[PDB]
Design a protein around this ligand. Sequence first.
Ligand SMILES: Nc1ncnc2c1ncn2[C@@H]1O[C@H](COP(=O)(O)OP(=O)(O)OP(=O)(O)O)[C@@H](O)[C@H]1O
Ligand SMILES: Nc1ncnc2c1ncn2[C@@H]1O[C@H](COP(=O)(O)OP(=O)(O)OP(=O)(O)O)[C@@H](O)[C@H]1O
Ligand SMILES: Nc1ncnc2c1ncn2[C@@H]1O[C@H](COP(=O)(O)OP(=O)(O)OP(=O)(O)O)[C@@H](O)[C@H]1O
Ligand SMILES: [Mg+2]
Ligand SMILES: [Mg+2]
Ligand SMILES: [Mg+2]
Lengths: 520, 373, 438, 17, 165, 374
Amino acid sequence: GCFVYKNGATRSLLGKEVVQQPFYEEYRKAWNQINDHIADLQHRSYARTLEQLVDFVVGQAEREVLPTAALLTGINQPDHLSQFTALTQRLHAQRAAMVCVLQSRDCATLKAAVETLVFGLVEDNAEVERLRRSQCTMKQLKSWYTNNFDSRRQLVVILPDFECFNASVLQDLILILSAHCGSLPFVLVLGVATAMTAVHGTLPYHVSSKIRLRVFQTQAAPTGLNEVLDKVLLSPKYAFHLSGKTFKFLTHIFLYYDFSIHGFIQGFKYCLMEHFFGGNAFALCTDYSKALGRIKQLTHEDMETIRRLPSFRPYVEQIRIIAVLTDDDYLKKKLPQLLRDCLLHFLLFRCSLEFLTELVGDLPRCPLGKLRRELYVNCLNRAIISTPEYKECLQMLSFLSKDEFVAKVNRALERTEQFLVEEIAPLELGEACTAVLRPKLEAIRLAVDEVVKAGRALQKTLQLIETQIVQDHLRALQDAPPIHELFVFSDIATVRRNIIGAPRAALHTALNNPHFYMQC
Amino acid sequence: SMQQRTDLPAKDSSKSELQLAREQLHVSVVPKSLPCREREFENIYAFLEGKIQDQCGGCMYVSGVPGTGKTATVTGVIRTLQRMAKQNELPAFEYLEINGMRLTEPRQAYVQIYKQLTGKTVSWEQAHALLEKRFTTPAPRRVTTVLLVDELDILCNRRQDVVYNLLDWPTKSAAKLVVVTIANTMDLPERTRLTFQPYSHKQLQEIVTARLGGSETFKGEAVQLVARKVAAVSGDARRALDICRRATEIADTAAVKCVTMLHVQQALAEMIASAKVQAIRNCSRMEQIFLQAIAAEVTRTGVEETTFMGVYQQVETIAAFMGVTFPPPGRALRLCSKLGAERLIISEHSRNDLFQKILLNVSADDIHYALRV
Amino acid sequence: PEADRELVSIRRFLKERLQRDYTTLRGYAKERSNVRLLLQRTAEMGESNSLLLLGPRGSGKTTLINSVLADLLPNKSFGENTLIVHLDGNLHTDDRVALKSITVQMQLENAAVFGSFAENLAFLLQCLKAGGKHSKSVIFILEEFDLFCAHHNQTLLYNLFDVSQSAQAPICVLGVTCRLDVIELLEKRVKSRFSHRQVFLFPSLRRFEDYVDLCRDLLSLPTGNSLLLAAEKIYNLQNIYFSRNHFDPGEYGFSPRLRDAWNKQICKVLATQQARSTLQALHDFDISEAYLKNFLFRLVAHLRPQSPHITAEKMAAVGSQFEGDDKIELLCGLSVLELCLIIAIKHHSQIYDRDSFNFEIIYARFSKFAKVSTTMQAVERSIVLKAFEHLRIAELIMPLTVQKEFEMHKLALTYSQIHHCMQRYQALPTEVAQWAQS
Amino acid sequence: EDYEIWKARMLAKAQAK
Amino acid sequence: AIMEEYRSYFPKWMCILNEGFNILLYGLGSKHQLLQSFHREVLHKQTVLVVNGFFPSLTIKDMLDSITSDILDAGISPANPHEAVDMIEEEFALIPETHLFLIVHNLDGAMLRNVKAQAILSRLARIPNIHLLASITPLLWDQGKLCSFNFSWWDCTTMLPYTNE
Amino acid sequence: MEAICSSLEPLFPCREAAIETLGELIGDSSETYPSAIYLFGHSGTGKTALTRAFLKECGKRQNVRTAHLNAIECYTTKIMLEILLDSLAPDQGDALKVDNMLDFVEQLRRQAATRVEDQGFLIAVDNAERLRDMDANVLPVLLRLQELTNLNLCVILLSQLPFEKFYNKTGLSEIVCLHLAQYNKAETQRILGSDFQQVRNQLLEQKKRLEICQEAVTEDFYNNYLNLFLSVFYKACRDVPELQLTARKCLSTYLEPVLLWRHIAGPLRSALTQIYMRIESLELPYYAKFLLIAAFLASHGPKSFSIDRLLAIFYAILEEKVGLTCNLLSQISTLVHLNLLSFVSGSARLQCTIGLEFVLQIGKVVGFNVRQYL
Ligand SMILES: Nc1ncnc2c1ncn2[C@@H]1O[C@H](COP(=O)(O)OP(=O)(O)OP(=O)(O)O)[C@@H](O)[C@H]1O
Ligand SMILES: Nc1ncnc2c1ncn2[C@@H]1O[C@H](COP(=O)(O)OP(=O)(O)OP(=O)(O)O)[C@@H](O)[C@H]1O
Ligand SMILES: Nc1ncnc2c1ncn2[C@@H]1O[C@H](COP(=O)(O)OP(=O)(O)OP(=O)(O)O)[C@@H](O)[C@H]1O
Ligand SMILES: [Mg+2]
Ligand SMILES: [Mg+2]
Ligand SMILES: [Mg+2]
């Protein structure tokens, strides 16, 4: 039933030509950037719960029922395996404990569970500082513990997938671990997926009589998605922005289907791959100096497919062109100004989004939504001023009393200026961004001084905020500056048909009309 | 080597004639020529003699119910052929042999066959390869070889290849192998043939009188009664030669030199035992009330399979009828466990009390026969 | 104190006699004589025999084999021309284990075990084939023969009979088993090669006077010359295995006045109608000597120095310990909530005729009492659920072989036990006692 | 509209500008 | 023309395999010739374990024994299947730049339809070194397997009859 | 045999007759042991602690070798024989190795010695109810270990069940059954009141409240408090350690006005509902919520259901008709994998496993009413 084609196996499939292309280098760099940023955000999110868990294990270590701490994690286990790995990293760094991770696949029976537990503890101590798994008795674990650490490390036993266990196997495991307490200091962290009522319902009297569990709560998955979207994919310093259709489709997959951050990262990775694998013309998309080096590197097929992108067409239509449409070298000389135009437009887009998100999400009823992501998808899908919801927002903002209105504009002013100092200032090509945005902010500040010293002037201040921030710095994607296709990824149809899977729909269209596919 | 006796064995002359008949009647003393197996002896001798002189090889399948003298006739033909081969009246031949019940695994025959060839011990994979190199390659002057294979059916089950190999080696012309297969069931190769009929009344009497020779220690009707009550059961000769030794021990303890017919009747009653009624008579009274109530529950409910709950209810009814109190169910389950250990009843493990099912192993009329009469 | 030491010697004597003392037996002249003549003829004349002890468990079969061996071993003919191989069906669960035990106990050349199970089988058959009438006689004793019938192919049994059927070493196979139809368990080759002689060992004390006589002989102190003859025989069997422990009666030497007062007290206690009624109950239940030895051990265990004498009230008390139901003593230990749950289960079972129930139906039938009970009004459903699982782990309730609160179940009790618990229970509130009546 | 007919008409308007 | 279009997809499939994604085809008819053409024309030198999941008599022991004995030369795998996947994960962690492709026609086959073998296949596809192509149901894939099976679905709807399958 | 009863009774009030019976059967080491002892009682009766203290005092005071086991640790016989030979054959070190029950019998047979030292052996097997689910030759050998080893030993067994459950088809050897009856309310009050010096010293170690405590914390106050405690709690449970652990915390709440029946009888009924729980709003994806309430509506034992009926009721309540994508069946599979659903069989049959309150909470946070369809 199976055939082997072994070719030199003992005891990066692409060659040098593809890796030496600029797009693989820039794609690997941008992907490494996004991946390291997501890992940094997850560690800064987990550090508090990590400190609480380490304080519980060390406090049990300072001092029969086994102490045990349930960790009420989310529906989807695999995101939290890295969290448990960080717990093992901290417990090894402090010399406070050693960890065995009992997956549900290892415990079909009590025997296999005891063998993988003892084997994981012994090899875990071997890797902090190969006998057969058949002889890893609990008595040998006791003799090895007396041989070592009596001269105290806790023996933490993570059970990440608590619901996937057989109930009788779990109860037998709890009784075996409780029988050896006193001699072996056990902490039994768990990874419950439902609620504490599932734990109390699957565990009867005799197993829960010897449990002194304490509940900890990991942060919510939508809270993690909102933090990741506000601090990584909407960061000004990254030049690759998603389109609003792709953004809404990925957030729709996360909020409406599965609470996996990893599936959202893989869908964004497939989006980044379909963007970057069209050629070196998509290798133009990064930071300004290496981009100028890329323009000095460019060949000709990239020039033809940078002529081929749809947003290039209004730029030529609004116009010399002979030297643009066929002379190549004049377009190579022309490229840095257009690239500087796109990067400046997206930085102004982020600062105007920060201002408008404060000014609209503080409002009651919120027609335009609260978070930056919802405003972001709405202003990129379509023009924001023409929406009826923005008209309702303008009505409720001119309806306000003067005091709450000046307080809201002053909060938006201090928020946008603090964002310009703390976040825009370190980036290169950022001095031009504050030089463009700040005089308009000063004009709005003079309008604030006019409405403090003086009802109708509140309408003049709203008109100035509309025509000086929303109108010029928050345009629709059709009105985006040219070759923004280098920076956005709007093709959601192919990513949707390659990620979302509907075998029954494909079988249905294959059994109704073959002519749709075969073209008979 | 096996350890020798410290003392010399007792001499033949001190034995009584009845003891001499007891040792001639032992089943280990095979006669040099088997009575009442002349057509099959001539058949296997003519077949094996033609296959030996032709130097061609082949296979044979002899079959019959156990104790009908299959292995004794086959070993007698091969011993007479080795004596004839030693006097150069026949072409010489090598005799390999195996037994299927002496093999821990069907594949271990490959370990054994090679042990009768070179004498080296090897693993069965290397042994199978060396046997294929020995058999499929024509190397004159190859001698014809005869492979007796007792108990073919254990090698047949679950491995498949071993019986296919043992029947496949003769078909090659290069292997001058003559394999003979002894078995019990006739239809075994599907599940050159020969069938061993069960010994009858007359052959079974003739066998025992041949073992006795001219000796008068046995009466002529005693062997007749033995043959009449053994041939209706099986046709086995070992059963007759065991019943005759038990009758000899009975006459020895009766201090008579002739085995008169009531010793044969007593030996037959002891060998074809039916001592369940004696067990029911020696059971305790509460066990007897239980054994009555099980048959009562079978007649009342119709179904032969009775639950412990309805049996205990009929137990309380019969105990109230008989005027004795009954033990509580925690001891009545122990009584059912004792009867299940005695195999008077069939019963489940006691963990499912009151719903365990109790088949009646003894016949329903045996209980009334034990306790009335 | 001297009377205290005489009582300590009597209690130590009676305990060591009821528990150990593996050789002496009572009754069975014909069966023990058959086994002795068979093994003696196998050791001397070299006939290869087979035998199959059968009978109910608790009848003395292992004690009979030990008695025949204790009679034959000091002859120095059976002890010099015959090696004995004990085997047990409980310990030798597989053919390789039984083969390694045979290879060790026969002291074969490959014992010293080295080699494979197949090399061991070939070596065992070659050492047996290498012999003749000049070789030492093996005597196999396969205790629990029916489990040896359960091994694969019965293959070890096929060897142990076949050597008995062949002109090789003179072996003897004494199968010992409790099943009455083990010969129908055998395969047809093993059944043909078996010699169908069968010694049955039914107890000889079905009539009650023999049971009282056995309890008297088990309790009476033998005369000291019989103790000396027993000590001489035990020293003879230790001059040549269980023999190192055994009874060893030379340590005890009772004064004649002590033996006279104890035998007088034993016959006087067994003359009374109450002790005869307690022995009548045990004889009605189980006649086997192990049951009486268990009862006598519980009775001899009570002889404190403050109360030296056996009395009829002690036999009535230990017999009441024997005759008592054990589930009622567990039902008496339950709290009032689980007992109310069991009464609700009994009502649901009486109405629906042993239909299977559920936690929900029982909680509803209990709640109909708890809303009007005026003492059980405040009890929450979680406490009732923990009481239901506590009933489930006691095997008072068994599964029909799904949520924990919805599993189907069967009552494990008869109704009479719950009704007797209703009278035996301590401090039952009257509302529960009246709801139980109707 | 196709990119090719747009690029061709733009190149003609470009040489004509 | 459709097979040529599916054949034109092939260099893009090689690039998608470098990022750790696994390829899945979910069309109606037989897709055996497409995976065989990708093995023939492209993977003529990479290690390839074709697996016929439509085989009546395959076991998870047969596929794991095939990998552990023929590719890794480790001998027979240990009797616990998850221990065999752990040993395979260790021994492929020992050999960077020795990728093992495996090309499973019919991942939904007769002995892989249980949840346990799908957890074993997900732990195998979890390995960074080895890559999975498969033909086709998602009821046995929970979110943990569908994250470990980093699938890239592809609509390969051939109209070929199910002869061998 | 007198020293063991004199030592255990101060540790164990109200267990005079049971300790006396065990000290008659397996007290003195010179007398031969019964072949097997099986003492039993309800949970909390004190058989684990009683056999542990009893085996420790006999093994410390005398020559006997004790071996305590938990049969749940013994998933196979090798583990059990290894622990049994590590205790009954002391100082063999790591060179010890047991293959099977026979080697255990031989290595225990090597341990026999002369009668003048009166050595004995003891094997306690706690949680003996698990022995019938393993190798089926463990229990019959353990009931006659004294006969096989030819050695002065006794095999204690400990379970919550009568010995009627333990019989098998092959039968069993004789055993000495022994009962540990659970305490009635007066004896339960005497044991709960036996730690007066402990709770008095504990309150005295943790300042006008300390002296006003020590002037009035005597036995009648604690006995009347335990009377009010058993007036309410003895009806629900008789497990003594649970009553100890609850009575200490409830006294810590009760003592405050002193530092009366109504102020404590408030919290006491709140603690009875949360007895045996020992602790010191389920967010879901949107379509997972709709599938979970559709399974609850389809089942309201709850009925088993096919997946096509489940998808049909979901499409009937969706009023949108989404396609059957992979993520929907992945949510079905992970609701199964989280024990939100179950596998009652297996045309497949699912079984919903939640209460009404969670369904109504999901329908409040969605805005799809449920009782209209109920
Ligand atoms: N015709 C006969 N004449 C004399 N003795 C016989 C005869 N038939 C059988 N016996 C005796 O009975 C025994 C039968 O042994 P044999 O090996 O022939 O049985 P078998 O048919 O091979 O049994 P199985 O089929 O069970 O192997 C022989 O030892 C022999 O002594
Ligand atoms: N005839 C007898 N003579 C002396 N003691 C007997 C006799 N029958 C039974 N006993 C006593 O019964 C107890 C158990 O007997 P024994 O060990 O012989 O049974 P058993 O044959 O081993 O039963 P099984 O083999 O079925 O377990 C022993 O203590 C023994 O003293
Ligand atoms: N009579 C008593 N006096 C004092 N403490 C007792 C008494 N009975 C039980 N206990 C207490 O009960 C606690 C544990 O009881 P134990 O575990 O021995 O019950 P168990 O019968 O083993 O329970 P299970 O059968 O569920 O294992 C011990 O800490 C002991 O102090
Ligand atoms: Mg034969
Ligand atoms: Mg016995
Ligand atoms: Mg316990």
